[PDB]
Amino acid sequence: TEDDCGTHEGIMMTPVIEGGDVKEPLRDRVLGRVTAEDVLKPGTADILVPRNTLLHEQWCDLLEENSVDAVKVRSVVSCDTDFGVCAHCYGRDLARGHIINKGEAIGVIAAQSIGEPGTQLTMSSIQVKNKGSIKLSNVKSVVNSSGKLVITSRNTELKLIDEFGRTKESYKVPYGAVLAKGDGEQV
Amino acid sequence: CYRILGLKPTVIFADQIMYTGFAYAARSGASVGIDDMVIPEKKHEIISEA
Amino acid sequence: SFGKETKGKRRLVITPVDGSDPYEEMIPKWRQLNVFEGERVERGDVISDGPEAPHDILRLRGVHAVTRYIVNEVQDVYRLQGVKINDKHIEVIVRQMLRKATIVNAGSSDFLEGEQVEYSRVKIANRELEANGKVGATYSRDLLGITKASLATESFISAASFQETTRVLTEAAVAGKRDELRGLKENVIVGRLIPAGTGYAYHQDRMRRRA
Amino acid sequence: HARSTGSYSLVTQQPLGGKAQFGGQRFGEMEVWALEAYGAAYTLQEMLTVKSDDVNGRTKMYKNIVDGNHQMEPGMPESFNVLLKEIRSLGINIELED
Amino acid sequence: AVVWDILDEVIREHPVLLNRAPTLHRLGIQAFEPVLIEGKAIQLHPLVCAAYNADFDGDQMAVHVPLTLEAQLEARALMMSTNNILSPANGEPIIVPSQDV
Amino acid sequence: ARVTVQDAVEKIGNRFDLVLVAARRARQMQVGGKDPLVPEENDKTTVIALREIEEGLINNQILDVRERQEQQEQEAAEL
Amino acid sequence: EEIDTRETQDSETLDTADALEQKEMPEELPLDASWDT
Ligand SMILES: [Mg+2]
Ligand SMILES: [Zn+2]
Secondary structure: OEOOOOOOOOEEEOOEEEEOEEEEOOHHHHOOOEEOOOEEOOOOOOEEEOOOOEOOHHHHHHHHHHOOOOEEEOOOOOOOOOOOOEHHHHOEOOOOOOEOOOOOOHHHHHHHHHHHHHHOOOOOOOOOOOOOEEEEEOOOEEEOOOOOEEEOOOOEEEEEEOOOOOEEEEEEEOOOOEEOOOOOOEO | OHHHHOOHHHHHHHHHHHHHHHHHHHHHOOOOOHHHOOOOOOHHHHHHHO | OEOOOOEOEEEEEOOOOOOOOOOEEEEOOOOOEOOOOOOOOOOOOOOEOOOOOHHHHHHHOOHHHHHHHHHHHHHHHHHOOOOOOOHHHHHHHHHHHOOEEEEEEOOOOOOOOOOEEEHHHHHHHHHHHHHOOOOOOEEEEOOOOHHHHOOOOOOHHHHHHHOOHHHHHHHHHHHOOOOOOOOHHHHHHOOOOOOOHHHHHHHHHHHHHHO | OOOOOOOEOOOOOOEOEOOOOOOEOOOOHHHHHHHHHHOOHHHHHHHHOOOOOOHHHHHHHHHHHHHOOOOOOOOOOHHHHHHHHHHHOOOOOOOOOO | OHHHHHHHHHOOOOOEEEEOOOOOOHHHEEEEOOOOOOOOOOOOOOOOHHHHOOOOOOOOOEEEOOOOHHHHHHHHHOOEOOOOOEOOOOOOEOOOOOOOO | OOOOOHHHHHHHOOHHHHHHHHHHHHHHHHOOOOOOOOOOOOOOHHHHHHHHHHOOOOOHHHHHHHHHHHHHHHHHHOO | OOOOOOOOOOOOOOOHHHHHHOOOOOOOOOOOOOOOO
């Protein structure tokens, strides 16, 4: 029922990666959505994608070239329009390819899109695969007498990040685990 | 084709693809026979070992 | 900290640095905990392992966290069968689930102490009051299932279409409700143009001659 | 089986069902949802009134089609009036306002 | 023999709606231009069957005629099969070839 | 027009407004007894209206201006 | 003649999850369709 609510909120999109296997790349999650913040190049403070840009295939290719990993986009949940939503918080009309037009019954479309495929549903060690830097997230550690540093935190995350800066494998190191390689080293 | 050129060329392309596929599928003479389901010769050895 | 022990249930007491120390929870002693007296925790810690209810996620983290959780769970279920569905549709369903809000303090608004009402009305009233220098009310979002969320409509014709007709008609007659014929199903029942698509503009013209 | 016009029910004033009765095809809720998702408001309105149970609208539409004027004048479906009478027979006062 | 010429004249550009039950999504009703044929069965384009979830082993379809100018223009501009190429659920093409092609 | 209405959609910018404008023009040509602005080649009024719209010769503002001019001429003649 | 009736009647309040939980088949299809589609 509206063109733009002017809000600045939005959700953060990253590729869906479980364990060492990548299930959803970033291109398939931001295609046809409208950015809520300026996408800066990772190296510098230069603006790569400006505010309020409908990310079509060209912008997805541009993001792939510069190896961006997380993008903030507008969603209908955080929309300021009352009694309806605006066109920019929704994004692309997937059946047409352009932006959504005012007056579209998107609720029925969503219900049908979720319900139609419902006729088909039925009624202990980390092993890396690619060379790259290893990043530890929320790690509390202590040195053992064996020379191997053990972890005292449940919320430690192990990330395989290449020189470009993309996270390809994200494992979860449990409490009390013994790490053969220390943080900041190269494997 | 749709992303580069548009809608009408895609429709024409789809019709041409359907026609050509049907024509050459008919021309091939592709059939099914009992000798197409070739069974490996090692099946009995594997079953005997199990 | 470990408070009173084996007094019916294992009582675990979280003491803020300068907050409400006596806040405590009656954790069952059968549950295997992963917390100690010497560990400082932040809101969202997994005191006992297991699957988590989305109500706690909404209450502690926020709207975006529970939206992400629901979208990810549904997509995990759908991907096993090789089905491709965009995340927009799940998001609009979730937005329809997060429609109510509970008042925690009335403030300058004429709302009650703890009544559950529509979120849009609350936000409109707050944005109006703040522009006049007054104080708006504060609230907390609620999460409802689709079955419970679809039973809170403000039209008795539409409600009687797909709910128990007798209950809806009795409640409407006792209250003395008035139906404005604003939705799609209401206009379908009386054979009018729906306020969507090629009919949408039409309704706007009507709304120009009404107000 | 095909139909253009024919005989209607006495109470609901809607086309009959079945090939043996020279009846029409049912346009159910899911078809209405599909039309709503497309956004075709005039197709849905013409399906709901001048093709099923708008008694004056049927005659006017037929006359206009024969005259070559493809335009309709929709009215109130008869089944809604039947519903109003049935609800009033239960002792409940329901009425159209203004 | 002249009513057949009249009939061929009146259906020249006049879409009809084909529908197959159950209608699970909005691609269960589409609009087509008729071509008059001899027989009693309806001929369907091979590239749309996947949208209807239809096969030729006994299935039946219903046909509806739009009456007013607005309905005809909605059928042409919104519900035509040449406009519904992409899938509204995910954006992928849905007229993809299969089997013999 | 006949197989794809994409050009008309681009000219107008909205499918619903396109349907409304085309219906208005087609009703003008059919019952109103006007004349087409494009050479009619065994086409119905709907397709003719679509072809006029995709040619830039018909839109909502043009219809309004033509209607106002015709009303002015009618009231000047009625004097 | 008049006979007693005390059997429970299903309503809308039955949640979607409970519908899939039940092994039995519904008395009347909620979906606006017959027993062949
Ligand atoms: Mg079959
Ligand atoms: Zn918005």
